[PDB]
Design a protein around this ligand. Structure first.
Ligand SMILES: O=C(O)CCCNC(=O)c1ccc([C@H]2CC[C@H](c3ccccc3)C[C@@H]2O)cc1
Lengths: 221, 211
């Protein structure tokens, strides 16, 4: 059906520039306005502006005039947003969304979002360690185990267990920025304290920003 | 520009309950208001357009209304799937503006955490420092205290916490406390205790170890 695909995560140094793509699909690209919105951790949603691919008409929120510039490729049905002279304030996730057309509108469709980070630091792959399940028999019933994803940059990261096979009771914590300037989070899972030696689990921690992809297993004592 | 006020910022209801949130415009926006629900970790999504026009494929338990400067979003029976932030937007004048958002948090039964302490892996200690992790699982409410004790010494300034949103299985919170110090400073001590105090507990639960 209709769908908007946004380019992948991006890291750029300050003073530099970036270009996000938004692939339209399943509808007439030219007649529908494309909205662009910014989302910073503590600022919720912010409106950057819109573009009418067909006519090329644009409407910029003054706050972004010059900072963001939209373009579109009618032949490839792809919209673009270029954030210039990037500073830390530009670090945020960016969405593109289909709005209205003169002959129709029944609600909007949203792109999955692009994460842009503005740092002079180089991308660092995560080191993952096992959160070895302690023989939890101390008056309870089940045991917990996980994976510690330490020192990576920038933000974008994902973890799983047994390849999403078993997602029953997993907990991935928001990443925490450390003093060293790197991030690190934890992914835990609680499984029947029983089936432990019977079945083993592996956390699939992949970090795009550096093409890292780990598949570490966790075993008891 | 046009201000869209949303109060409160956090609304609480329990599954099955009817809840309604509001969006106060700073001037007649002529029923030109959209409602987007944004789940954690996901992108916003449109629920209602033009004040009361429910988007297609969106639960009937959702309804929108309002006029002039006052609009509202109501859910006749709150199921877990509705957990998340709700923003309103006005397209009556440029630039289109957003409301600050209302987080819809579920109110449920008090629940004590299951505490689990994990020690620094053999593999991670071959490198520089050592990290002890403490786990408080599926508890409610979110208010929980966690102190770190190293040989009875109440640690301070070397711990970092991180909490997850209300799990969709039970609407509970989970938390992780991570203690970090060098390999040396680590070996220099023997007992690592994690103290947890939660209103769902008769008295504080501790989980420690030796090595
Ligand atoms: O017949 C009549 O007079 C009424 C119908 C005319 N409709 C409009 O003028 C009309 C004007 C604007 C819009 C807007 C609504 C917000 C939407 C949007 C989506 C995501 C983020 C920001 C903004 C974009 C859309 O483009 C929708 C409809």
């Amino acid at each position: 059906q209709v769908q908007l695909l946004e380019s992948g995560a991006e890291l750029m140094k300050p003073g530099a520039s970036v270009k996000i793509s938004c692939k339209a699909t399943g509808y007439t690209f030219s007649s529908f306005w494309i909205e662009w919105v910014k989302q910073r951790p503590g600022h919720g949603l912010e409106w950057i502006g819109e573009i009418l691919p067909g006519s090329g008409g644009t409407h910029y929120n003054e706050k972004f005039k010059g900072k963001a510039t939209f373009t579109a490729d009618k032949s490839s049905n792809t919209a673009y947003m270029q954030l210039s002279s990037l500073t830390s304030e530009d670090s945020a996730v960016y969405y593109c969304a289909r709005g209205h057309s003169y002959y129709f509108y029944d609600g909007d469709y949203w792109g999955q979002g692009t994460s842009v980070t503005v740092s002079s630091a180089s991308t660092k792959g995560p080191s993952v360690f096992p959160l070895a399940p302690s023989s939890k028999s101390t008056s309870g019933g089940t045991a917990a185990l996980g994976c510690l994803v330490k020192d990576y940059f920038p933000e974008p990261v994902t973890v799983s267990w047994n390849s999403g096979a078993l997602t029953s009771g997993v907990h991935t914590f928001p990443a925490v920025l450390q003093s060293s300037g790197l991030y690190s989070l934890s992914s835990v899972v609680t499984v029947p304290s029983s089936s432990l030696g019977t079945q083993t689990y592996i956390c699939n921690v992949n970090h795009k920003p550096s093409n890292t992809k780990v598949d570490k297993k966790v075993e008891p004592k | 520009e046009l201000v869209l006020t949303q109060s409160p910022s956090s609304m609480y209801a329990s599954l099955g309950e009817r809840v309604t949130i509001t969006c106060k415009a700073s001037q007649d926006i002529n029923s030109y208001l959209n409602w987007f629900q944004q789940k954690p970790g996901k992108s916003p999504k449109t629920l209602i357009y033009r004040t009361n026009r429910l988007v297609d494929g969106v639960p009937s338990r959702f309804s929108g209304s309002g006029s002039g400067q006052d609009y509202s979003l109501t859910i006749s029976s709150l199921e877990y799937e509705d957990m998340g932030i709700y923003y309103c937007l006005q397209y009556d004048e440029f630039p289109y503006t957003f409301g600050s958002g209302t987080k819809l948090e579920i109110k449920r039964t008090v629940a004590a955490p299951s505490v689990f302490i994990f020690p620094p892996s053999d593999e991670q200690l071959k490198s520089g420092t050592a990290s002890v992790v403490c786990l408080l699982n599926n508890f409610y409410p979110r208010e929980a205290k966690v102190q770190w004790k190293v040989d009875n010494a109440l640690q301070s300034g070397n711990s970092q916490e991180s909490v997850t949103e209300q799990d969709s299985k039970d609407s509970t919170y989970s938390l992780s406390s991570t203690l970090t110090l060098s390999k040396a400073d680590y070996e220099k001590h023997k007992v690592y205790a994690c103290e947890v105090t939660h209103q769902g507990l008769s008295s504080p639960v501790t989980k420690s170890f030796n090595r």
